[PDB]
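Students often ask why we bother predicting the structure of a whole assembly rather than each chain alone. The short answer is interfaces. A chain on its own may look different once its partners are present, and contacts between molecules only exist in the joint model. In this exercise we take three input lines together and write out one structure for the complete complex. Read the inputs first and try to guess which parts will touch.
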Amino acid sequence: PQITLWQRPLVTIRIGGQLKEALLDTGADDTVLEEMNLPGKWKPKMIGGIGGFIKVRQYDQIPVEIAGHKAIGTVLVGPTPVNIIGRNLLTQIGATLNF
Amino acid sequence: PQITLWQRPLVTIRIGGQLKEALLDTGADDTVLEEMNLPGKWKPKMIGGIGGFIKVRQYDQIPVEIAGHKAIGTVLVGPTPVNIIGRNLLTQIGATLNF
Amino acid sequence: NXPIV
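Now the answer. The structure tokens for the assembled complex follow.
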């Protein structure tokens, strides 16, 4: 579909059987979801942005459905205020910026 | 143009007569640039990112040319790891997300 | 405002 930017680009995603609301972010190198207990082995890591860095758990090869579109990749879980879908997953669903 | 997301969507912008590189950021409500001097008065403001809150200087009604397209809006100047063009200016140039 | 680097 085509999403205007008058409002935050929030969409419904599905991960770990759960349905969620996440922001489509072209400015995020990675996908970061708010605290959740996913079964699986993870590796610790740090990501930063405005304000500094936060510690997150890295999970690989997680199936994620973005608005009916399937994708699979690395998901970071941590103390983020919003669920964010980054480029690693947007490239998989063919998302482009147009103007 | 149509920009894919295999790489950070960085484009050249012109502001205050200067040329800069900035990230087209759908996950940012605001436009935040690394510290620079812009003409006109500014007001202290605070904004939040992934790592927390920072103090910024707010400049209103600043003309900015993004890849040739003109926009005139609020620009925040502060300690950001990268210059970002947020939704406040992306809507003026008619940027949309498509997949 | 989320870069996420």
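Check your guess against this: Chain A touches chain C at residues 23, 25, 27-30, 32, 47-50, 82, 84, 86 (CB under 8 Å).
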